[PDB]
Amino acid sequence: VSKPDLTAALRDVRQQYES
Amino acid sequence: VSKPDLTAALRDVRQQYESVAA
Amino acid sequence: PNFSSLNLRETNLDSLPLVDTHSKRTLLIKTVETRDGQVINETSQHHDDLE
Amino acid sequence: PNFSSLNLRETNLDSLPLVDTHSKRTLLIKTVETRDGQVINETSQHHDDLE
Amino acid sequence: RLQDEIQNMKEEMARHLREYQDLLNVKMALDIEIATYRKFSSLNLRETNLDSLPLVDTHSKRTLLIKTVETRDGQVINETSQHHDDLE
Amino acid sequence: FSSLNLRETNLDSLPLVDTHSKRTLLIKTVETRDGQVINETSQHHDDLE
Amino acid sequence: YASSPGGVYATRSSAVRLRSSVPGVRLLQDSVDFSLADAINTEFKNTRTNEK
Amino acid sequence: QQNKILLAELEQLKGQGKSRLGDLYEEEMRE
Amino acid sequence: TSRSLYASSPGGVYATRSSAVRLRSSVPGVRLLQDSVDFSLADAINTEFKNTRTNEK
Amino acid sequence: TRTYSLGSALRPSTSRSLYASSPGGVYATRSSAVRLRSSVPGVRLLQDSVDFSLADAINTEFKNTRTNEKVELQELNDRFANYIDKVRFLEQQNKILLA
Amino acid sequence: VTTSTRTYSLGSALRPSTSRSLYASSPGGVYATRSSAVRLRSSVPGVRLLQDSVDFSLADAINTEFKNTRTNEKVELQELNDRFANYIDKVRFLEQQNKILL
Amino acid sequence: YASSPFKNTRTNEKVELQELNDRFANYIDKVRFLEQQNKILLAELEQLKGQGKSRLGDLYEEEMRE
Amino acid sequence: YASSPGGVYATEFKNTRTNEKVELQELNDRFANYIDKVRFLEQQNKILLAELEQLKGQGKSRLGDLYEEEMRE
Amino acid sequence: YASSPGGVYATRSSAVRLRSSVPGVRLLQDSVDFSLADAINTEFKNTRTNEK
Amino acid sequence: YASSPGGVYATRSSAVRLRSSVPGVRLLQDSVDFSLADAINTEFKNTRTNEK
Amino acid sequence: GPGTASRPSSSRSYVTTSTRTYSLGSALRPSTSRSL
Amino acid sequence: DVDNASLARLDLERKVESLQEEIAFLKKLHEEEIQELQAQIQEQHV
Numbered sequence: 001v002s003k004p005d006l007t008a009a010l011r012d013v014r015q016q017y018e019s
Numbered sequence: 020v021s022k023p024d025l026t027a028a029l030r031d032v033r034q035q036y037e038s039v040a041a
Numbered sequence: 042p043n044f045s046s047l048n049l050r051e052t053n054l055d056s057l058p059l060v061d062t063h064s065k066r067t068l069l070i071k072t073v074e075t076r077d078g079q080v081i082n083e084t085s086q087h088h089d090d091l092e
Numbered sequence: 093p094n095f096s097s098l099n100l101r102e103t104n105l106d107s108l109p110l111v112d113t114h115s116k117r118t119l120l121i122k123t124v125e126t127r128d129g130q131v132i133n134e135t136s137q138h139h140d141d142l143e
Numbered sequence: 144r145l146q147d148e149i150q151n152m153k154e155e156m157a158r159h160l161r162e163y164q165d166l167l168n169v170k171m172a173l174d175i176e177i178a179t180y181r182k183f184s185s186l187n188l189r190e191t192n193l194d195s196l197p198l199v200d201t202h203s204k205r206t207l208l209i210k211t212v213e214t215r216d217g218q219v220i221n222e223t224s225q226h227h228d229d230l231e
Numbered sequence: 232f233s234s235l236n237l238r239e240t241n242l243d244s245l246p247l248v249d250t251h252s253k254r255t256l257l258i259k260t261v262e263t264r265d266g267q268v269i270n271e272t273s274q275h276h277d278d279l280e
Numbered sequence: 281y282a283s284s285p286g287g288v289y290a291t292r293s294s295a296v297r298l299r300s301s302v303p304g305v306r307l308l309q310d311s312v313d314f315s316l317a318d319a320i321n322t323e324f325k326n327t328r329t330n331e332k
Numbered sequence: 333q334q335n336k337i338l339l340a341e342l343e344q345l346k347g348q349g350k351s352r353l354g355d356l357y358e359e360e361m362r363e
Numbered sequence: 364t365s366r367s368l369y370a371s372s373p374g375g376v377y378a379t380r381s382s383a384v385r386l387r388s389s390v391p392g393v394r395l396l397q398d399s400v401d402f403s404l405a406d407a408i409n410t411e412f413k414n415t416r417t418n419e420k
Numbered sequence: 421t422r423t424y425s426l427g428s429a430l431r432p433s434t435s436r437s438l439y440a441s442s443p444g445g446v447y448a449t450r451s452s453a454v455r456l457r458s459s460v461p462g463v464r465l466l467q468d469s470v471d472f473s474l475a476d477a478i479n480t481e482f483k484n485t486r487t488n489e490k491v492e493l494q495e496l497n498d499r500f501a502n503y504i505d506k507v508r509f510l511e512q513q514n515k516i517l518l519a
Numbered sequence: 520v521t522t523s524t525r526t527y528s529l530g531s532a533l534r535p536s537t538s539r540s541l542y543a544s545s546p547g548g549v550y551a552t553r554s555s556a557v558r559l560r561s562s563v564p565g566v567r568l569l570q571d572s573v574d575f576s577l578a579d580a581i582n583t584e585f586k587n588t589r590t591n592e593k594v595e596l597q598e599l600n601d602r603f604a605n606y607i608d609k610v611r612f613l614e615q616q617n618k619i620l621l
Numbered sequence: 622y623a624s625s626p627f628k629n630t631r632t633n634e635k636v637e638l639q640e641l642n643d644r645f646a647n648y649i650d651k652v653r654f655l656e657q658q659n660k661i662l663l664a665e666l667e668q669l670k671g672q673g674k675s676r677l678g679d680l681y682e683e684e685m686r687e
Numbered sequence: 688y689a690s691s692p693g694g695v696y697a698t699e700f701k702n703t704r705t706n707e708k709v710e711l712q713e714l715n716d717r718f719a720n721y722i723d724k725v726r727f728l729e730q731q732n733k734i735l736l737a738e739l740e741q742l743k744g745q746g747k748s749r750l751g752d753l754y755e756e757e758m759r760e
Numbered sequence: 761y762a763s764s765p766g767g768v769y770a771t772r773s774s775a776v777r778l779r780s781s782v783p784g785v786r787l788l789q790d791s792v793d794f795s796l797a798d799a800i801n802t803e804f805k806n807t808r809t810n811e812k
Numbered sequence: 813y814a815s816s817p818g819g820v821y822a823t824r825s826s827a828v829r830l831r832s833s834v835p836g837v838r839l840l841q842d843s844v845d846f847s848l849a850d851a852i853n854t855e856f857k858n859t860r861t862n863e864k
Numbered sequence: 865g866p867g868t869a870s871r872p873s874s875s876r877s878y879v880t881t882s883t884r885t886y887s888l889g890s891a892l893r894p895s896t897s898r899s900l
Numbered sequence: 901d902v903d904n905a906s907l908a909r910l911d912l913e914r915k916v917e918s919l920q921e922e923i924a925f926l927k928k929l930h931e932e933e934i935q936e937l938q939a940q941i942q943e944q945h946v
Contacts, residue, residue: 311357336417469681590660
């Protein structure tokens with residue numbers, strides 16, 4: 001829970017650039 | 020002990036704004 | 042409609058022989074054979090008759 | 093079938109191995125108190141306790 | 144004679160487990176027969192799936208109780224009830 | 232096609248459980264008394280635990 | 281709108297069952313009639329015989 | 333079929349609905 | 364506008380553990396045998412005393 | 421028209437009103453009446469102890485209960501591997517529906 | 520204005536746990552009361568049972584660690600339980616993607 | 622309750638992803654308690670098992686000494 | 688406790704409440720993992736406070752209490 | 761003396777809805793007793809007698 | 813000596829706990845007070861800490 | 865009407881009847897039983 | 901324990917009598933269960 005996710009923020013930017 | 024209460028709405032309104040740019 | 046073949050049975054009126062009133066006549070012949078006043082035998086014949 | 097009519101009842105199946113309910117249980121406690129080989133007391137206490 | 148009565152009650156419990164799952168197989172049959180009368184949509188499958196024959200280890204109490212009575216007499220003193228509680 | 236319904240009945244999920252190793256209660260007194268044998272027991276129960 | 285509660289609480293009691301070392305509990309095993317269930321089985325035959 | 337669903341949702345409450353009631357009264361008679 | 368009692372266990376009921384004083388009575392165990400240990404073939408047959416009504420109807 | 425009052429589906433019933441007043445403490449009854457002149461020497465020695473093989477059965481049941489507490493963590497590791505293979509299965513199903 | 524009337528989770532307000540038990544020390548009033556008898560002068564040659572369990576205690580701290588070893592393995596059981604629960608939520612997320620592509 | 626009659630979905634997807642980590646924590650609590658209620662029970666027992674036979678021979682040789 | 692659902696006097700606002708309450712459920716469960724930190728220390732401190740009584744009970748008392756009677760024999 | 765306090769049972773089957781057959785005609789306004797703080801000072805009066 | 817603690821009969825207050833009629837036609841007038849009566853229950857705690 | 869003016873004022877305070885493990889005076893019976 | 905057991909022998913004469921009418925209710929139950937199977941076969945298919 002102390003992992004307010006950075007891999008989600010890097011997953012957003014990739015799936016957002018793909019879109 | 021790390022952390023409390025709130026990280027969601029600052030993370031969510033950002034990842035929503037990224038998803039909302041597309 | 043040839044019903045009364047069912048007839049939701051007839052698992053029956055059951056005047057069956059499951060009786061003990063028909064009483065369980067406990068004829069307890071407690072034959073206390075004493076010699077001199079001391080018990081030598083107690084031949085307790087339980088005839089356990091179900092009438 | 094029009095399924096029914098019904099005799100399921102215990103006409104002498106109840107009237108069970110129930111004796112009264114009581115086995116005519118004639119508990120004759122014949123206490124033969126003997127001392128030195130002689131009878132000194134013969135207390136024949138009947139109970140007819142239900143069973 | 145109590146293991147007869149108890150393990151017969153655990154047979155009938157173990158039978159009621161399979162017979163309640165037969166009633167679930169009658170339900171799940173009607174779920175897929177409704178689905179295949181649609182053939183598309185009521186589809187039934189599964190299966191307890193993940194970890195569902197678990198590590199029940201358990202490995203229950205296989206207690207080899209050797210009563211090693213070392214008879215140089217009795218009050219002198221060796222009632223060695225060796226409980227080898229094995230986990231098979 | 233289909234209506235097939237063979238599924239689990241707790242045969243695919245199972246209890247493992249094992250026990251009954253033989254609780255051999257070989258109870259044995261003796262009782263030598265005063266330097267003389269006054270009884271010689273050697274009992275053999277196996278308890279299926 | 282029929283909001284009516286068809287479920288009534290079939291009220292169970294079991295206060296703590298003391299030392300019943302009093303042996304005077306006679307057996308009786310009186311059952312089951314239930315001839316209304318064989319009347320209902322006959323009404324299911326009759327309702328099928330009407331449906332026929 | 334609305335009669336057949338009603339006969340099926342009843343016939344175990346009629347015919348077996350007396351035989352299972354003697355079946356139970358002989359368990360109540362056993363204790 | 365129908366809605367009715369969709370609640371399970373009326374009154375909150377389930378078979379809560381009773382356990383009393385440890386009375387050691389012997390009981391000689393005169394069985395009522397229960398030939399209705401799910402006479403159930405009869406209640407599937409109560410559904411078929413009514414599938415027979417469904418086919419005729 | 422729905423058959424629903426709001427919140428009626430779940431009232432988590434913490435009504436479990438149990439009272440166990442039971443006295444688990446029994447008096448392990450000691451006696452010591454006044455120990456007279458034991459100048460009678462006939463007290464033979466015996467020193468017979470301890471088995472207690474039930475305590476080594478309980479030590480083996482603590483190893484077995486830990487080995488269950490480990491085989492449960494291992495079955496739940498393999499169950500998380502089964503749900504990673506369900507992650508891969510719904511990923512593979514969505515890739516079949518894509519193709 | 521139609522509204523579903525609010526009910527509530529009042530089964531949490533009904534929290535009776537009426538437990539009280541034997542909080543009394545020394546059952547039967549017991550302590551080691553002084554015995555002192557007739558002054559018997561027996562010699563006793565004192566063949567010792569030695570007691571290697573004069574608090575074998577390292578063994579009973581170890582009975583607590585034969586059970587701290589169970590506590591750590593069971594903390595890992597709960598952490599790996601809740602790890603399989605996290606990967607079930609990862610299944611629910613890909614089951615939602617599988618409904619989009621369907 | 623007997624009733625008879627995509628932007629803010631991105632915020633709910635991203636916070637169902639975060640509530641899934643917070644349910645990982647609350648399910649890891651449930652696994653930490655599953656193991657630790659076994660671990661308290663193993664610690665409150667293991668001195669009654671293994672030492673629970675060795676301390677019983679240790680005592681029977683004191684009873685054997687008198 | 689007894690929360691009232693009163694005040695409801697009648698899809699973006701459906702999905703906004705699926706958001707807002709779960710921007711408040713990461714929340715309560717970040718607070719819960721900080722309470723469950725208190726339960727983790729209460730459990731590790733409970734194994735510690737059982738092990739500390741096994742320590743005192745065995746080490747100085749029970750092993751002293753025995754070998755101080757063997758040394759007397 | 762093993763006191764176990766009584767569990768909180770009250771009418772949780774109320775408010776399935778609030779009724780509208782007579783609705784909530786709801787008289788507000790506020791600034792009301794507050795006699796509870798004067799009674800905490802009659803508590804603190806008989807606390808002055810217990811301190812002294 | 814053997815003093816009895818008998819006579820401590822705590823009276824359970826059983827107010828109606830429902831506002832005027834059905835779900836109400838008034839709201840303001842329900843006597844916001846009763847934390848006064850529970851502050852008087854702590855006045856009678858501190859009175860017995862005094863009096864004894 | 866039926867209705868918030870019919871006022872479902874049901875703030876759901878659970879009446880927590882706090883169960884204590886205490887009979888009055890049970891904590892101390894000063895035991896002058898020393899029957900020597 | 902023999903006076904108990906010999907009265908218990910007379911209990912089986914009563915219990916075998918009772919169980920023979922239980923097995924008669926169970927036979928009547930099979931005859932109703934066969935009529936219900938024939939009703940269910942007609943009820944599922946018309």
